[PDB]
């Protein structure tokens with residue numbers, strides 16, 4: 036039975052509006068409704084992994100697991116195994132996988148983050164799951180961010196608290212937050228970003244939705260505009276939105292958007308918005324292809340419609356050689372040549388690098404770089420040809436070219452990371468000096484760049 040080099044992943048997000056679901060929710064898992072939808076000819080083909088995020092979920096874990104498993108069994112005739120379930124208040128994440136994957140999945144983590152202080156602590160935050168699928172790390176975040184059209188900045192703050200404080204993946208990757216810990220990271224939920232148009236334009240917006248003319252609405256979507264201005268979700272992807280706004284509907288129909296201000300809304304308007312979203316971030320040059328992104332039309336218990344997204348995701352096998360794991364493979368090496376970091380910091384400390392990768396027995400600390408001034412104000416940290424030669428555990432190019440090197444640049448004075456990035460070993464050539472580049476971030480915000488050349492030796 037061969038190990039896969041691709042799997043498909045279903046991501047669902049649904050704000051259930053504190054109501055039980057209807058008796059049939061299969062359209063959700065089949066990616067049927069509006070937007071980029073899945074071909075009828077695939078309906079019986081199970082996804083490898085289903086990740087369900089709910090918000091305002093009134094069900095017990097048991098109640099929801101029974102509905103989910105019975106739904107998937109009805110669609111696929113497969114009895115899925117529960118990988119993980121984690122709930123914070125009424126925010127929940129469930130991960131189900133095909134039974135054949137049970138001994139491919141390991142290192143299962145769960146965590147949550149509560150966002151806000153005093154007033155603003157008590158119902159918003161995130162839950163997450165991570166695990167290994169053979170040689171591939173997968174992370175999943177379901178977040179319910181702050182509501183309200185005039186709180187986009189609070190949403191952006193919620194995002195930065197969640198990526199700082201959600202403790203998933205390999206705790207040895209200590210300089211790295213979740214945005215660097217996984218081959219593939221999926222972040223979804225009721226992100227609560229709104230279409231920022233005047234209240235008076237509510238009926239105009241509704242008209243546009245009935246005409247399926249989303250362009251003038253998406254140009255005002257706060258998540259798209261905040262992302263374009265690098266305020267949030269830096270280096271994440273989202274598939275083009277081709278489905279109607281998923282909020283705020285009258286319940287038991289989808290024929291009416293309920294946007295007017297009410298006591299129940301705190302006298303806020305809820306103009307039709309794409310609150311419910313799926314984004315991802317994968318390591319450079321790993322296969323990830325969105326194959327569906329849309330909303331259901333027939334699930335009407337909530338004032339939100341469910342959103343689905345499906346992905347092809349590249350995966351690698353758990354590699355064993357005669358040598359590694361448990362020793363180095365003298366036939367392999369990674370050399371970083373003529374490298375320099377460009378940092379936005381005003382601080383004058385010395386800096387050193389750390390190289391972290393599951394292709395190394397443990398992380399490698401460099402010597403300090405040489406600080407110079409850039410022509411436009413910047414700190415440039417030069418490493419020359421002084422960087423430690425990295426000794427991978429396996430030299431086989433079928434393994435090594437699929438790996439990645441995480442880089443942290445740290446202050447000698449404080450040992451704190453000023454920037455984190457990732458370099459793919461999927462090179463155009465081995466034994467050849469080739470340009471490398473990564474942006475550097477810290478707390479998910481841009482702090483600089485790392486660039487130079489790499490020379491990779493494999494056993495071929």
Ligand SMILES: C1C[C@@H](c2nc(C3CC3)no2)CN1
Pocket residue numbers: 079108109110111112113
């Ligand atoms: C309910 C179970 C659904 C299902 N059929 C299959 C295979 C074609 C035999 N896999 O799932 C069909 N109707």
